[model samples]
Target: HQCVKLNDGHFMPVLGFGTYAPPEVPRSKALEVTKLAIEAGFRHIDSAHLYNNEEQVGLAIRSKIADGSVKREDIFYTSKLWSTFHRPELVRPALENSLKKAQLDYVDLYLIHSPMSLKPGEELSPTDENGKVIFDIVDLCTTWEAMEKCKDAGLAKSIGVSNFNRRQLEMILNKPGLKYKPVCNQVECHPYFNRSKLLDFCKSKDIVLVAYSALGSQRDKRWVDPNSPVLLEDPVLCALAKKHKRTPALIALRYQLQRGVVVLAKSYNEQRIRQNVQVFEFQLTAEDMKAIDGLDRNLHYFNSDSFASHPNYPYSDEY
Candidate 1:
């Protein structure tokens, strides 16, 4: 039930349930686990068009509502505008498409999935024969203008961006006719890649830093480097878990909340889904926080190297 107030005067539960599953997993799992997540005390649900499972996620929410578990107003749902839909003309329709598919009236928060723009098309990741991702060029500020319009039209309660670095966020914050500043910047943050610099920048602007991949990642071969060490198995985290008599995952999730970062926990297993909610039942001491801080390697598991050549790619900056 703990929440953070966004810059736009909206409250989002600090702990969110991420509904992204690797391609090998069946979409039906999204419905089952999302329902399980709600039963496990998750009030914030994060999904995206690229996930190709909005319908199932939406179904889970409605089922919970019908069964008297939660009302529509009690839940905060988030969806993203994928890279292919960054074009100004395509922005609204893409959101509309998501709404139509989910059969939801409107989303609580909508975000630009990434700064990198891809060709405007049905194909999520269009690629050349050589297997290079086809990229597109579009002025991001124009896309922001369209995002603002979605807020005005009541399609989204709040608007934000994900995977945007400080420079990219500054572009929107400092725009000439900016109507609404981003409410948050959702990115990958964990003990190994704590993102302290970016977190400080977002705080100065009153933008919540939402952390995904908080328990390392699903290690999906496509999005993650195959050889990256597992985060939960790290010696520091494991030692802290043993000391606290908790799972390493709990320590990781609690570390984010102690730092005031909203975090998403993605899990399909029933036991882990139920266990993740215990994050709020415990606390981490200053010394524990400092020890976790020592684990930062400036490493990233979800680096979208395919879009590295794009004009607006975000990781090149220091933060």
Candidate 2:
């Protein structure tokens, strides 16, 4: 497996397994499928507190370790801190809860799930009477300061962030008395929304770009627009798949690796889960890469426009 060394001096597998699922998938499916992914040679497993499957994800991990398939250290498990616990004082407990749920001592990487913060409370999501979302104005730097403590305390090996834009990333990068720089910024990326400029900027800062939705939209109508472009169905991508005699999914996954971006493959079916790893079997030509580059429409399937009204919304400006 190919690996990328983060600025924090840790190696992360370029290929990982994404554990996020739409509401239709039963929660227990996480455990069943995560174990399958591990046995299929996927060493990196991504999960989050918001997924409501941390306990199941942890069980799958421990089950594999118990069966001698892999050890805790052999698996690069990544989890995220939800917005509900973004306050500087609550970050530790938030991580601790995730660790407890995953039944692990520490996560290889811990990320603040998003740039936005929610009002401090026991509720995972606190909404107003009309069902509108509530927002908090916590100083992001203060929240980051606490994340540094988690690293120093040995709770998380490497600390990073997710869904943060260029300016938000710079806010952390340029903060005074910064104890540790973020190692990666996880974002929604694919052929339809290649995020070329953002990827280049993160590269310049020595922050590895980790991509979710690398294959395409998850087909969850609640979050994804029904009329959005289907990455696998892109004429250019389908043609490339035929040229290489590989599945369209493989073409999409391989594209990101060649671009130096770490990508996640999510699936519950055993066959697809096994096939997702075959990406390492072939390489795309420079011409193929360039052709795919022209397919970027700069359209986000998960257009988070609902949150645009929030003060700390991240996507208003160019990267």
Candidate 3:
């Protein structure tokens, strides 16, 4: 697997397997699909506490290890600290919980799932009776302190942030007494929402910009806007796919790689999981890359409107 070296001096596979499924998909499916992903040549596995399937995903990794397909060091596993655990004291425990669930001693990368903090408790997204999300206030720098401690304690090989805008990332990058800088920023990036400015900023800081939703999104109504146009269906991507004799999905994944962005491709289907591995087999021309770039509309599929009211909401700033 090709890799990108992080600011923290750890290498992460450029192409990763994303393990987030909607609530409707059975949790056990992650186990089966992740195993298939490994079989299909994915070494980077991306998951989150909020996804609620670390146990299954971890088991898949262990199962592959048991079968001699890969070793622990060969696989780059990433897990995130949920927003509910954003309090500094809770950060380690949350990571520990994910490690416990995944039955791994340490994760290659650990991330703050989002900038917003939620009420700490069993509820993943604690909500009021009126259906508004309950938000918690905690300084992100304090939470980052805990993350740095996790690395110091050798619990995570590297630490980073997800769903953070450029300003939020700057807060950590420029903080006083900063022991370690974030290795990467995982965000939604695709042809329609290419995140060029943010990518350049991260590149300037030498922080790897890891892309999630690189194939657009699952369009799960719970997280994505139903009205948002399907990304794989975009005319430009479709045209490129036909020109290259590849699936639109492959064109989308290849676009990110050409931009020097590490990308995550998520799928539950066996055929697609196998097909996604072919992203590394082809190249996109500069004209093809520019055409894909023109598709950027600053459109966000996962705007995270549920946490929009929180002080730490990341989308308010233009990245």
Candidate 4:
């Protein structure tokens, strides 16, 4: 398995099994699929408290280890710091909650789920009376300070950020009294949104760029644009798949590897779970990589308008 060395001196698998279960996908399914993912040779599993499936994911990992397929040291489990717990004081408890749910001693990696923050409480996305997101005034640096404590306290081996823009990352990187910088930046990256600029910037800073939605936008159907073209159906990708004699999804996954990006592949089907790891078995040619590069439209499938008013809405930056 290909792995990226973090600034904190840990190796994270280049490919991970994502367990972000949407509303349509029952939370119970995360256990079955995660178990299958480990059986399929995936060593890193991504989960979040926001996803509300940590216990199920924990169950899957425990089952795999109990069967002697893997040991705790062999798996790299990552959970995130949700927006509701962004306050510096609450960061530890939020992380502890995720650990309690996963029943793990420590997470391999933990990230700030989003740059923005909500009022502190059990509710993940607290909203106002008008149905708008209730925003908090806490600075992200304060949150980063708490994340640093997670590392120092042995609650997390490494800490990073997700859904953060270039400027937001700079804030943490340039924070006063900074003890450790972020080791990675997790974002929505795919063929349609290649993230060339952000990738280059992170590489210069020695920060690993972890790609989520690598095959395509895995947004819940309710938030996805029904009229928009599907990513897997892109003509360029299909042509490349044919030339390589692989599925379009595999071609997509291979493209990220050839570019030196850490990628996450999400699937619940047994066959697809096994197939997703095949990305490392084949390689994409230089011509193939360039062709996929031409498909970038900076297209984001996330619902940006929903949080447009938040003081720290991150998607507005150029990346």
Report the Cα RMSD per candidate.
0.9, 0.9, 1.0, 1.0
lDDT tens readout by residue for model 3, 173-259: 899999999999999999888899999999999999989888888888877899999998999999999999999999999999999
- Candidate 1 deviant stretches above 4 angstroms: none
Estimate the TM-score for candidate 4.
Answer: 0.98
**Model 3, which residues run further than 4 Å from truth?**
none
- On lDDT, the candidate that comes out on top is 1
Model 2: per-residue Cα lDDT over 1-319, one tens digit each: 8899999999999999999987678988999999999999999999999898999999999999999999888999999989988889999999999999898999999999998898788887789999988999988889899999999999999999999999999999999999999999999989888989999999999999999999896868888888887889889999999999998999999999999999999999899999999999999999999998898888887777788888888778875
User: Taking the tens digit of each residue's C-alpha lDDT, what string does model 1 give over 252-279?
Assistant: 9999999999999999999999999999
Cα-based TM-score, every candidate = 0.98, 0.98, 0.98, 0.98
Per-residue lDDT of candidate 4, residues 137-177 (tens digit): 88899999999999999999999999888999999989889
Kindly report which residue pairs in candidate 4 clash with one another: none
Best to worst by lDDT, what's the order? 1, 3, 2, 4
Candidate 4, residue 285: CA error in Å?
A: 0.8
Worst 10 residues of 1 by lDDT: 304-313
Cα lDDT, model 1, residue 314: 78
Query: What is the number of backbone collisions in each predicted candidate, taken in the order shown?
Result: 0, 0, 0, 0
